[PDB]
Amino acid sequence: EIVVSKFGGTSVADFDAMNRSADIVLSDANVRLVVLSASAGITNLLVALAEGLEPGERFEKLDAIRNIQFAILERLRYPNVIREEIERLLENITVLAEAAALATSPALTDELVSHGELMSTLLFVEILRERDVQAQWFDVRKVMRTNDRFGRAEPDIAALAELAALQLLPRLNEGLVITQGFIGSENKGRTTTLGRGGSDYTAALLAEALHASRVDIWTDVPGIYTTDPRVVSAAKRIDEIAFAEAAEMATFGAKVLHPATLLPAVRSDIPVFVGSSKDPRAGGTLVCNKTENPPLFRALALRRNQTLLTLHSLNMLHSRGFLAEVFGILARHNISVDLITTSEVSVALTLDTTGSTSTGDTLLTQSLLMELSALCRVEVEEGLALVALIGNDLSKACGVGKEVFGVLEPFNIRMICYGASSHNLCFLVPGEDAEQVVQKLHSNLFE
Amino acid sequence: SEIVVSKFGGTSVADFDAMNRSADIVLSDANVRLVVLSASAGITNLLVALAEGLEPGERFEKLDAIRNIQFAILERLRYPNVIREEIERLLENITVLAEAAALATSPALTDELVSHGELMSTLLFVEILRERDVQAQWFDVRKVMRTNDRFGRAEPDIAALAELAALQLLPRLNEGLVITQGFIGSENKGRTTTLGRGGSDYTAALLAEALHASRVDIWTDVPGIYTTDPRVVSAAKRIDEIAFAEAAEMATFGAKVLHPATLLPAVRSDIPVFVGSSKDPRAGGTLVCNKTENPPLFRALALRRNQTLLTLHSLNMLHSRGFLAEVFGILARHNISVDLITTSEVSVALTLDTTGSTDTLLTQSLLMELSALCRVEVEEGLALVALIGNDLSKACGVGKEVFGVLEPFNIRMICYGASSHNLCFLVPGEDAEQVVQKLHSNLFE
Ligand SMILES: N[C@@H](CCCC[NH3+])C(=O)O
Ligand SMILES: N[C@@H](CCCC[NH3+])C(=O)O
Ligand SMILES: N[C@@H](CC(=O)O)C(=O)O
Numbered sequence: 001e002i003v004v005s006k007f008g009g010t011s012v013a014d015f016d017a018m019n020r021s022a023d024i025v026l027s028d029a030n031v032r033l034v035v036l037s038a039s040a041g042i043t044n045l046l047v048a049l050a051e052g053l054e055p056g057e058r059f060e061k062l063d064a065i066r067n068i069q070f071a072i073l074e075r076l077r078y079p080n081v082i083r084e085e086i087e088r089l090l091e092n093i094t095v096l097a098e099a100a101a102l103a104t105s106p107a108l109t110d111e112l113v114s115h116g117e118l119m120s121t122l123l124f125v126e127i128l129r130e131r132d133v134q135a136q137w138f139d140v141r142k143v144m145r146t147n148d149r150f151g152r153a154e155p156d157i158a159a160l161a162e163l164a165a166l167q168l169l170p171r172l173n174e175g176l177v178i179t180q181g182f183i184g185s186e187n188k189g190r191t192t193t194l195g196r197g198g199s200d201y202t203a204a205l206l207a208e209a210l211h212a213s214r215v216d217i218w219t220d221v222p223g224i225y226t227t228d229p230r231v232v233s234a235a236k237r238i239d240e241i242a243f244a245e246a247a248e249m250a251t252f253g254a255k256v257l258h259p260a261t262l263l264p265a266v267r268s269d270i271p272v273f274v275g276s277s278k279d280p281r282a283g284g285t286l287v288c289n290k291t292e293n294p295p296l297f298r299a300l301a302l303r304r305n306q307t308l309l310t311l312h313s314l315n316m317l318h319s320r321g322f323l324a325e326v327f328g329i330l331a332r333h334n335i336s337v338d339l340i341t342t343s344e345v346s347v348a349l350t351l352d353t354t355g356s357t358s359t360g361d362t363l364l365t366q367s368l369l370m371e372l373s374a375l376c377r378v379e380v381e382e383g384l385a386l387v388a389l390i391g392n393d394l395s396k397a398c399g400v401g402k403e404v405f406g407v408l409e410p411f412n413i414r415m416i417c418y419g420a421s422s423h424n425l426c427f428l429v430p431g432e433d434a435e436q437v438v439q440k441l442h443s444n445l446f447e
Numbered sequence: 448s449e450i451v452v453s454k455f456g457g458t459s460v461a462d463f464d465a466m467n468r469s470a471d472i473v474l475s476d477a478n479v480r481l482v483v484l485s486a487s488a489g490i491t492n493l494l495v496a497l498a499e500g501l502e503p504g505e506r507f508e509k510l511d512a513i514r515n516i517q518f519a520i521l522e523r524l525r526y527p528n529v530i531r532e533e534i535e536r537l538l539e540n541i542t543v544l545a546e547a548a549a550l551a552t553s554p555a556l557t558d559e560l561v562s563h564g565e566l567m568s569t570l571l572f573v574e575i576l577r578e579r580d581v582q583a584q585w586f587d588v589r590k591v592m593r594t595n596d597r598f599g600r601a602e603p604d605i606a607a608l609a610e611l612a613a614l615q616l617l618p619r620l621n622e623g624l625v626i627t628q629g630f631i632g633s634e635n636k637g638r639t640t641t642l643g644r645g646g647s648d649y650t651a652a653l654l655a656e657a658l659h660a661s662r663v664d665i666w667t668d669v670p671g672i673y674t675t676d677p678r679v680v681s682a683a684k685r686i687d688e689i690a691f692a693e694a695a696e697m698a699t700f701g702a703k704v705l706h707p708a709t710l711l712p713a714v715r716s717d718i719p720v721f722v723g724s725s726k727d728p729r730a731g732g733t734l735v736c737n738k739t740e741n742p743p744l745f746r747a748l749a750l751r752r753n754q755t756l757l758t759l760h761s762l763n764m765l766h767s768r769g770f771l772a773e774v775f776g777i778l779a780r781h782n783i784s785v786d787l788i789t790t791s792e793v794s795v796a797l798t799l800d801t802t803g804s805t806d807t808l809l810t811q812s813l814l815m816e817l818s819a820l821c822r823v824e825v826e827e828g829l830a831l832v833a834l835i836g837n838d839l840s841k842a843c844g845v846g847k848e849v850f851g852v853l854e855p856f857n858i859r860m861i862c863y864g865a866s867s868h869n870l871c872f873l874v875p876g877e878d879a880e881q882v883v884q885k886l887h888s889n890l891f892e
Contacts, residue, residue, distance in 0.1 A: 248792045253765055259793070260762040310865065314708040317701050318803025321779030323788075328776070331769035340771075340795070342788045343866035344696045344833075345707065355766030381842060397826060399857030399874055406854070412844030415864025419873065420758065421791030428864065430843050 002172060003030040005216040006181060006203035009040035011277045012120045014068075015075040018127045024218065024280050025176075026133065031216065032172050033206060035140075035181040036124060037199040038116025039068050046116050049093070050109040052100040062094055072123050082126050089115055089122075106150035110183070111191040117180035117199075125178045135176040140202065142167045143209070144184035146192045153184050153192035155205055157264070164209035172210070179206075200261035204272070208264040215265050218277035219256055223285035224249065226446045227300045232439050234447050240286045242294060248390050248424040250301035254354045262287060294392040296403070297445045302438050303386040304431060306338070306353075307364065308415070312346040313376035323347065326372065333368045334359075339386070339417050339426070348415065350386065350428070384414060385434035387441070388426035395422040407445065411437050450620065451476060453664045454483040454629060454651035459725045460568045461488035462516070463523040466575045472666065472728050473624075474581065479664065480620050481654060483588075483629035484572060485647040486564025487516055494564050497541070498557035500549040510545060514538055520571050530574050537563055554598030558631070559639040565628035565647075573626045583624040588650065590615045591657070592632035594640050601632050601640035603653055605712070612657040620658070627654075648709040652720070656712040663713050666725035669703050671733035674747045679880055680887045688734045690742055690837070696869040698749040698833050702802050710735060742837040744848070745890045750883050751831040752876060754786075754801070755808065756860065760794035761821035771795065774817065781813040787831070787862050787871070796860065798831065798873070829859060830879035832886070833871030840867040852890070856882050 005028075011021045025031050037043070045061045053061060069086050073079045096112050121137060128135040143163040146153030171177050182198025185191055194201050200217055207215040222237070228251070229235040243266045246252050247259035262272050266289045275284030316322040326347075330337060336355030341348050351363050364380060372378050394404050395418070408416075408427060415428035429437050453476075459469040473479050485491070493509040501509065517534050521527050544560050569585060576583040591611040594601030619625050630646030633639055642649050648665055655663040673683040676699070691714040694700050695707035704722055713720050714737045723732030764770035774795075778785060784803030789796050799808050809825060817823050839849050840863070853872065860873035874882050 247762060247765070250792060253792070259765060263762065308864075314695055314706075314711065317695075317706060317708070318784055318800060320782060320784045320803060321775070323785060324772070324775035324779040327769070327772040331772040334768065336766060336768045337771060338790070340788050340790045341862050341864045342786070343862065343869040343871070344698060344701065344786075346696075346865045347788070348865040352766060355768060395859070397859070397875070399859035399878075401857050402854050405850075405858070409847050409850065412841075412846045413850070413863075414840065414842065414844035416861050417789050417791065418858075419756075419789045419860030420794045420796045424791040426791075428844075433844070 001030055002032050002210055002212045003028060003214050003216065004033045004035065004203050004207045004210075004212045005031045005218065006035040006199055007037070007218050007277060008199065009037045009043070010220065011218055012036050012124060013040035015072045015127070018072065018124050021218070021277060022124075022128055022131065022133070024277065027280065030213070032176050033210070033212070034124070034176070034178045035199055035203040035206065036117065036120050036178070037181055039072070039120045042068055042116040042119070043113060046093070046113045047109065049097040050100050050104065050112040052102070052104050053097070054101065058097055058101060062097060065093065066090055069119055069123070076126055077130055082122065085122055086119055089119055107190055110150050110193045113193060114183040114191045117183050121178055121180045128176070128178070133176070135178055136171060136174065138168065138171055138177045138179040140179045140181070140183060140206075141185040141191065144202070144205070146184040146186055146194070148186045148188070148190065148192070150190075150192055152195040153186065155184065155194065157208070160205060161209045164206065168206070169210060197258045197261040200257045201264075204262050204265040207270050208268045212270055214271045214273060216273045216275065217257060218275055220276060220278060221256055221274075222276045222279055222282035223274055224252060224256070224299065227438060227442045228302050231302060231435055232442045232447075234442070236446065237283065238285050238299060240288055240291050241298060242291045242392075243287055243289055245294075245298050245390050245392070245423050246287045248421055249299065250303050250386065250388050250426075254303070296393060297389055297391040299390045300438055300442055300445070301386075301388040301390060301426075302434065304434055305382065306350045306384045306386045306428065308348060308350055308381040308384050308428065309364070310346060310348040310379040310381070311372065311376040312379065314345050315375070316347070317345050322375070325375070329368070329371050333365070333371070335363055335368075339415070339428075341415055341417060350384070383431045384428045385431045386426060386428055387434065387437055388424060389441075390424055393422060394425050395419060407441065410440065448659050448661050449478055450480055450658050450660045451478040451662045451664065452481045452483060452651050452655040452658070452660045453479045453666070454647055455485065455666050455725060456647060457485045457488035457491070458668065459666055460484055460572060463520045463575070466520065466572055469666070469725060470572075470576055470579065470581070472725060475728065478661070480624055481658070481660070482572070482624070482626045483647055483651040483654065484565060484568050484626065485629055487520070487568045490516060490564040490567070491561055494541070494561040495557070497545040498548050498552065498560040500552050501545075502549065506545055506549060510542055513541065517567055517571070524574055525578050530570060533570055534567060537567055555638055558598050558641045561641060562628075562631040562639045565631050569626055569628050576624070576626070581624070583626050584619060584622065586616065586619055586625050586627040588628045588631060589633035589639065592650065592653070594632040594634055594642070596634045596636070596638070596640070598638075598640055600643040601634065603632065603642070605653070605656070608653060609657045612654065616654070617658065645706045645709040648705050649712075652710050652712040655718050656716040660718055662719050662721060664721045664723065665705060666723055667704055668724060668726060669722075670724040670727055670730035671722055672697065672700060672704070672747065674891045675883060675887050676750055679750060679883050682887070682892050684891065685731065686733050686747060688736055688739045689746065690739045691735055691737055693742075693746050693835050693837070693868050694735045696866055697747070697835050698751045698831060698871070702751070744838060745834055745836040747835045748883060748886055748890070749831075749833040749835060750879060752879055753827065754798045754829045754831050754873065756796055756798050756826040756829050756873065757809070758794060758796040758824040758826070759817065759821045760824070762793050763820070764795070765793050770820070773820070777813065777816050781810065783808060783813070787860070787873075789860055789862055798829070828876045829873045830876045831871060831873055832879065832882055833869060834886070835869055838867060839870050840864055852886065855885065
């Protein structure tokens with residue numbers, strides 16, 4: 001009967017926040033394992049340093065990190081002892097940072113970055129202790145065995161499960177355990193990280209390893225609703241959603257956590273509750289491997305202001321590699337493609353704003369357009385809104401009738417994507433229409 | 448401006464009888480004064496084979512093959528010796544270039560080699576006509592088809608062509624009928640060069656564009672475009688005029704007929720491209736025009752049966768960059784052309800372009816490389832059904848006027864939004880016919 005709880009950077013951004021999170025932990029007596037990320041902001045400063053910065057900039061980042069740590073220390077009733085550990089860690093970072101300025105590598109990047117999670121974990125244990133709450137510190141690296149793919153270490157499930165039993169379970173029996181997420185260690189001892197989503201990933205991995213009954217992921221959203229309540233107030237809360245559906249949930253990956261991270265939990269049938277740390281009472285949503293009787297339609301997603309790139313060229317006809325090159329170009333220009341539809345001599349795609357760097361004002365630079373125009377007539381359309389129906393049995397080898405199609409009859413559709421998934425059916429409409437479409441589509445499918 | 452250009456592909460000049468049948472079509476219209484020809488059927492391939500460099504043994508089996516085709520036509524002539532030595536001469540040249548190839552190869556050498564195919568057929572065709580007391584002269588396109596040095600895919604210099612055409616081609620056309628080669632050209636430095644697949648059709652267009660031709664006739668193996676495949680819905684009517692933009696989006700136009708890219712010079716210069724059948728000129732054809740009058744919401748529906756649907760699933764493509772870049776890379780490397788593509792959040796489904804690929808397209812080798820980063824699922828026997836038309840898409844979207852059309856059917860995949868002229872989807876084979884027949888009935892019949 002072990003529950004694992006995970007908190008992201010904001011939940012542990014500072015003193016006040018950490019208490020707030022403690023409040024939530026203590027709330028449930030079954031949570032005995034807590035996985036934390038680095039205090040908000042920290043990981044980024046650490047990565048900036050790991051790149052190697054000249055002394056000046058190097059310390060602006062360093063001090064930044066310090067300021068964050070002490071803002072939490074100072075509020076403790078006995079900052080003395082703790083301050084020591086942090087001071088020690090902070091100095092270590094300063095040196096490694098000096099090193100980075102001379103020699104860099106993914107491996108060194110990991111050891112550096114990892115300190116972020118070590119500090120917050122240490123501090124969080126003090127906050128709880130300061131509440132006459134028995135809680136100990138634990139180094140996940142004692143259990144999180146990964147390969148040496150520094151930056152994106154692959155967890156060794158078997159090892160993890162074993163080591164977890166040898167060192168983690170015993171401590172959990174003594175009581176509450178507070179540990180880091182996102183980090184791990186390779187066989188040869190070097191520190192490693194698990195890439196974006198790491199902490200969420202960890203909470204699942206540890207959960208899988210300890211046959212936990214459930215895993216709570218505290219985010220900035222009360223869970224998923226049938227639709228954006230800001231659009232249709234009648235929007236009801238979805239209690240249980242299937243993994244397969246959640247993954248296809250647009251506003252889930254974007255506004256919530258990444259589906260890949262929960263895989264260890266789902267594959268081991270351990271419910272993942274997704275709630276909001278800024279409002280625990282509101283309840284949340286359970287992401288399960290399978291749900292009792294899955295509805296034909298489970299929810300409508302809305303992603304507004306999507307840019308439609310249409311690529312036209314008689315030369316793609318019967319040619320090999322035209323797209324191989326176009327997407328190559330797109331990748332090189334730091335862009336993630338979301339939707340894609342094709343005609344005989346033309347292809348239209350939308351930019352994935354979430355997986356594309358916000359470095360600038362517009363994703364489509366004349367640089368990219370020139371590279372593209374070089375092999376097709378580029379036409380652009382912005383202000384389109386993506387509307388998506390997440391559900392079940394929306395597609396079958398024998399096709400699907402109007403049961404699934406008639407739903408989109410009353411609207412002017414500019415693009416349709418259907419067939420890829422039996423859980424998703426999305427299309428594009430002009431922004432102006434976006435809300436009426438959603439409101440009407442919801443009314444007849446859920447209201 | 449009453450200059451009409453006519454082009455005939457390899458089949459139309461495959462042998463003697465064929466060439467005469469083509470001539471019959473030429474003389475059919477008194478306005479055709481320029482005739483663009485491909486090499487006789489088979490030849491171009493043997494030439495390419497040779498250009499690769501073959502050991503003496505195989506090198507001559509292809510060599511001899513080429514010869515046998517040329518003489519099959521020579522022997523049927525009344526006064527053969529009037530051109531026997533020219534062929535003989537060209538054939539010898541080929542034999543040595545071929546020996547050379549076996550030692551040193553390059554696109555450049557490959558063009559000079561293959562070009563001989565068109566040189567021969569054109570020379571023979573001219574004798575067929577003269578043997579008919581028909582005044583017709585031979586002309587080397589290369590005196591006017593100026594291109595860059597991109598051997599294998601030379602880019603025509605329109606300006607140059609337009610100029611040179613006036614200086615050397617127009618003058619000859621005035622004297623009477625002119626028979627010239629297609630697919631080949633020459634670069635500034637004099638080297639022979641080719642225009643890539645479709646070349647002959649491409650030439651017919653460029654020459655037409657350069658001579659302000661009133662029309663261009665491309666004789667193929669189909670009597671033109673119909674509302675649907677006649678073998679599916681007999682009520683299928685023949686389409687007189689089709690807009691280029693529409694034609695390009697016709698699945699079966701590119702497949703059977705010819706490639707849209709090739710007609711570009713014609714369309715951009717508003718020169719109607721008549722597409723008919725050489726195996727039956729009576730049946731009439733279709734006019735591919737830049738624009739037409741009262742373009743219909745629906746112009747026709749196409750059917751491409753037995754398509755293979757490849758579905759790629761992987762939670763890791765979500766928010767990742769380059770997932771597709773790699774997938775398509777792999778696909779290219781394995782000589783596969785992707786036709787249709789549709790996406791969901793964590794999966795992508797595409798169909799293989801049977802025409803631009805080529806025992807089985809999906810080898811365990813490719814599936815291995817692909818499985819490496821996603822769950823591959825395969826479905827074959829699907830039929831592509833496409834609606835070709837106009838205004839099928841707009842910035843503000845389209846209502847049920849265009850959608851209601853496919854309500855009555857069980858659809859397995861839909862692609863819409865890329866083009867305002869096309870709307871296609873997939874359905875299982877079994878359904879294919881009924882779908883087409885019913886769709887046809889309420890849209891055309
Ligand atoms: N974003 C991925 C493709 C995702 C396709 C499915 N929506 C890429 O840029 O390669
Ligand atoms: N056949 C091209 C893409 C064309 C897509 C639209 N018909 C390729 O596989 O690179
Ligand atoms: N801290 C890691 C993992 C996580 O936040 O879940 C990251 O920045 O991606």
